[model samples]
Target: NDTLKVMTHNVYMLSTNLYPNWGQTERADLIGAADYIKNQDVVILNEVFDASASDRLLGNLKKEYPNQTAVLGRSSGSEWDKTLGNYSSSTPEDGGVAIVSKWPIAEKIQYVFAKGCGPDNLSNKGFVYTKIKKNDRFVHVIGTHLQAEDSMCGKTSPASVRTNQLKEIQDFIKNKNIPNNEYVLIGGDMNVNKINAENNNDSEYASMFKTLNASVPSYTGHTATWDATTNSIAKYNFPDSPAEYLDYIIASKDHANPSYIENKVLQPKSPQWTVTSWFQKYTYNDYSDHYPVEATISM
Candidate 1:
């Protein structure tokens, strides 16, 4: 087949040693999520900060996706270092990102952002580039998680920083001089919400496409990938989080038509996890606060 099934998911496996209560449930959730996305040809992952959790996930996925890239970025500092709260973790953080593939990977590279602000700096935030050999050609994929807005920043926008990071990616890819015949698809939790409202992030969303000279693949299904009102995990993690479109899979403009047979903010079939917070117990089907963006792409 000349098509590809891809997904971008943030596993949200925090250090169990830090959030002791979350580990057990998250590990179970990881296994469930692995089963859920096992069919994908490529999975771009983020928030895989815990070493044991990473092993658990990749081990389960190895049978389906034998070719995988090393976790990109540097080890993470404790949550206390970011001052998100009183939490602390000494365990090694796998730069919170990696790529797993069904096809053989021809070449791979990693790049960590040099400039980070606020809590985003606590982890080595960056992207992974993988060139995979498919049916008759090579496909270049860049998976990344950009800077995020933090409550600790009060009012400052992370838009500019995100833009610079996009530019950096553009520069890096530009230098590669990848062939036009081979598709270049960039996917990840870009963290730039595409919506219009007070505190709107639509402008940055447009800038991302503009900066990359890319176009989003034709998509179907729910557009909101993160919504506190609907997703239990989101509500538990960020009670105030609004519905937002923060994840995407965009192809370089020069590539041929790239369309999705199935594109959605994935919802679990049933509750797969149980968690407690704020004196309340909650059960959630999602593996993370942010939903996985699933797609089957045909080029």
Candidate 2:
């Protein structure tokens, strides 16, 4: 029985400047997220800061899962070749992609800076690939955090940019240079809505997934993953919609079926973070704006 349990989460940076009232309780919630990772084989993490922060988080997580290993992707700032770049002054809170796994990572690579869609120009957000040795072959696990500022308030520029980015990524993978049947599993904060019933699959972002030939696995019960109204408070302002499945676990065409491999989204029992009455009139305290999405893969 060769199966793997994988988790993908975008841990909002523990920053006071960005989120002024984010306190120890919020940090506690962030730590509690590690509990969700317990016993999992691989974790595709997004928006993680430099080595120091990674060490701190992984250290806390290691208390329970000692065998975990973390690999950080290149900084969003480093992705561009502008020597005049300054992350310290411009974007004080800097972080990149990461992967923490129980299994050995044989080969890993970061996407070329200009390779993917959405915010690739300014931010260091891209994919991280880890080759896991199975019974006789290896599986390629890729994680990413795409442009988050796309079409938030009915703006089309950001969405268009992201659409182009997806095209570039698909082109790279489709090239004959890369192996086709590598058993690819790509996941992360795609920042695009795929399961929003209100939109009725009419969004440009929803079409992106189909164009790339990926599938968003369905869960057993209710389908929505985001709650916009409840998340509109100051703490969770970024995510303001009836839970939409922005985070996803997608497989290449070859691994689309259960016979070869299967995927499912493990919805969180509750919102990761909620507002508290004491701190502000209307706010919540919790780990992150978005919840963790877990998947079980049979290879």
Candidate 3:
């Protein structure tokens, strides 16, 4: 039997502008988030925004993941726009995505989305691809943060735009033609608002991965990867935005062959969406709006 540990988290350590009127020093929050990530064998993160936020968080992670890497996406922060006469901070140079790992990185790629839908066009969103050796075998670990439903509030881009973005990534992966034998997977904030939404591509991607035993349902626990939905967030992140199931950790394997190592791997794990204990008392609530989801397996 083979066992290992893997994890995916959208650290959500962005600026006050994104959340609005709350620019407290997130360094401590970032430090705590970094603490959670350092212990893992493989980590893929998204939405690490603002220059200061990005710089310090990566600095804090270096000790945990010595052989790590990341790519800056669109602007995670913005300024007041006079034309709209509302809080509109869509800059071209916001913060980007990041990845850190235990194994040495053999190869990697960074691709920004050609079409950023609605407000998404404001940020430079894309995929961060990395090739690492896990279990002495090559594994393509792709991490990304797709378009958000922010347009519902301001109407920059709509659901159709993100669909294009998701399809774009899906087609890109298919074009790569990764063989079934080697390990392959994706993790990040796909921005799928809930179990199903015409605006998001939840079924589309889950179905795509299912064909290869590479979806969250394939995980042993099948726990909800996202938990901040019911939590109070409208005033913080977006107007009238309540909660969402927009994160994942999908693996690669053929359903025809039950012996695929993914089947033997331990069930994925995630800290309670709510604060569970002391010391770590305020992880998600204090550190980040989103919880960390991880799969612990060794082979």
Candidate 4:
């Protein structure tokens, strides 16, 4: 009965908001996202460029879940500010990832991607490594975010850069000095789509899936946590493809059989959002581009 119900989400940053009232929409989404996550035992968050976002979320959740953490990554910033866009967020250094847990974080650290593409270098981006007490023992829980296929940076494609990112994490996990042969629970916005049938054949998704020594959990937290971009998806100009699983909750190595993935679609709760109609009714409006996935594991 000692398992963790963990959620992973990208909570989309405020980069595009610098220009206009659209920022209002982002603020609302962020506020909604904050409210939505208060109940989770652990949340691994990505794309947290706006430091205020983390500050506000941590403060809001501290009323209940007080253990909040993040790191500074990439450019023009430190952990206090994890921003990724060239525009000023007032607090510029707000660029990194986060880990919020109900359990005490035994020991933790973070890393910045040595290589970034296009504006990605504007803010630092990387993973927040954490060790939490689950079953009277410690388990590895990593929250990471990687580069995108259409990162607005043409030089390094997401396919090539992502594999390296994953590989780096592979080594990073080792350096964390986790107990030998222990459980590793990694969740993040790999930015590599594995939901479509064809992706199984695509090396971009296939080989890395193997390299990570990880597998998809049996459950996804939502019916369609992909994207309802608010408006003009074409403006963002993403790789033309189907909306599928870009975010994930994965279990890797160490002789673990998960009890379940908290199939929010099947054994779902009445979600508190206005949107619906994805998984035959296990529906809710998305707060970000990537849906937060939760896992119930007994590894």
Candidate 5:
């Protein structure tokens, strides 16, 4: 039987100006970090700005691993042309979600615009379901970056928006009614805490996971991907403290129960920089504020 390795990351837009503290060298370093983590059969990425930028970044990585293919998918209203024409006070940047796979993408479906979120809230929030043939079996991979806090009615917090978005995706997938036994993996920077029992149970994100019969791999209760000093996976940073786990890779329960799933947090080996008084720096700075979470599944 063939095994599939998948990775998910929210690569904070590879932006230098916004992150003035990080220079061009820092940006390149971050990309290199991503390249190291993305050495898998499939990669689901969020916050990629445009096709050109995605190509340029992934192109560099292809020099090492030539078999990979990166496919960019846009949500409604995320297009530069559309945003420019509308010229509203709330136009967002073009950094959208993308998927990269080593196998051939046989089919793809893009879910865009909240069908039920009404007109004014017509944000480009959706998923990219790619079908890849592996060992004569078709595996469906779904990747998405749901509506951020600001994308909602401008009132909900990031946590609240994430909750709603998670429900929206759950309903969308449930309605599709794909075969129960089919290989399905949903990955992305969900931007919500999976280990937080308090919010996890009550929030929409948690509800979606329950509805889909999925489980988060390994790790204890509360662990975050972001850290001010180490900038790596700090096992337990308190709410008043530093640690939290936002990124995730969730698979169907069928795969989870058989021990066919393996998950881990990719911590950097070296520190990128040092802030004397503020925070201890980690050298694994290749791209983004969060570390990548990887999972491997077998049938």
Candidate 6:
């Protein structure tokens, strides 16, 4: 039997223009996050847009997780870009997704989702795949961040767009032909909540599970990740956004009957940070607007 500990987190480390007070506090928070997940076997992160922020996080992670993938969709002209084909854009930012592992990584592949709406197109949003070797066997892991229908997009219908992206993900996995011996896992900020009317796209959510062929994790009531009522960052910055679960870590059905030890939002030791916006001061004590989802699996 083999066991692994994994986590999916949206660090919310973005450019100053994207989220006004982020730059002032991210460096310290990034280091804090590294310490928080020091013992995890595999970790996937989103919203690591800026190169400087990526450096700060990845540099600290290297001491513990020596095997890590470069920030996918960070730039073009690389072998992965040519292999996956680039997503054309006048100005493309990072895909903002990455995976750090304690095991050796034998293969790394990334694909930028061709479809995006509103300001989401500004970044090359996509999924990253890593084939990691542990104790003479390989495990397949895919990390991604899907589109969000926030006020920034003028409240357009993201259901159709997100559905198309899910189909693309299905097709991408089919072409890989991963062997049956290796267990497969998909984790990250899916952005599709089960109970939130505004956040849940029934069609897209169904397709997402079909694509992975995995058992669904229950998320409701207090299990919410984007909790505006509790998370200080969400309350201060995204008061209008609904409180919902937006992150997950799931395994495909092909895996051995795996037992979950811990699968829930992380309660990290977050110190309060002060922010000034619109001539007002505010304080928050969480790492990001969305809390990280962590799990330990024994197969």
**Largest lDDT belongs to which candidate?**
6
Deviation from truth (RMSD, Å), model 2: 5.4
Candidate 5 accuracy as TM-score: 0.70
Error of 1 at 201 (Å): 12
Top-TM-score candidate index: 6
TM-scores for candidates 1 onward, in order: 0.84, 0.72, 0.69, 0.75, 0.70, 0.87
Model 6, 160-219: lDDT tens digits are 667677667667766778776567788888887754343454555665776667766544
- After superposing candidate 2 on the true structure, give the runs of residues whose Cα lies further than 4 Å from its correct spot: 14-17, 24-34, 50-53, 63-95, 112-121, 150-156, 175-181, 197-202, 229-242, 254-285
lDDT of 3 by residue, 84-114 (tens): 1111245555436777788778866666676
Ranking by lDDT: 6, 1, 4, 5, 2, 3
lDDT of 1 by residue, 1-299 (tens): 66788899876777677765564445544654455687788999887777777767777778788888766654323311121111224423446778889988887777777666677767667788888888767888889998887756545567777898898888777877987777788889888877673244356777788799887555566768788887766787778967888888778776544654445777653446566666777676666767788877776
In the order shown, the candidates' Cα RMSDs to the true structure are: 6.0, 5.4, 8.6, 6.9, 6.3, 3.2
True-vs-predicted CA distance for residue 168, candidate 5, Å? 3.0
Assess the local accuracy of residue 126 in candidate 6 as a C-alpha lDDT between 0 and 100.
84
Q: Each prediction's Cα lDDT score?
A: 0.72, 0.56, 0.55, 0.59, 0.57, 0.73
CA deviation > 4 Å runs, candidate 6: 17-20, 23-35, 77-83, 151-156, 196-204, 218-222, 254-262
lDDT for model 1: 0.72
For candidate 3, give the lDDT.
Answer: 0.55
Per-residue lDDT of candidate 5, residues 1-299 (tens digit): 46778887776553344433333343434465544465588777776654455556566556444434333333333321122112223433432566766766776666553332322244355566677776677777878765543444544455555555566666666776767767778888665655455454666556657755777566532255655455532321222344556677777664324356776667544335432223654333335566777777766
Pick by TM-score: 3 or 5, better one = 5
Pairs that clash in candidate 1: none
How badly does each model clash, as a count of residue pairs?
0, 19, 17, 12, 16, 0
| Candidate 5, superposed: residue stretches over 4 Å from native | 14-35, 50-52, 63-92, 113-123, 149-154, 157-160, 198-205, 220-222, 232-241, 254-258, 269-286
Positional deviation of residue 30's Cα in model 4 after best superposition, in angstroms: 6.8
lDDT of residue 154 for candidate 5? 43
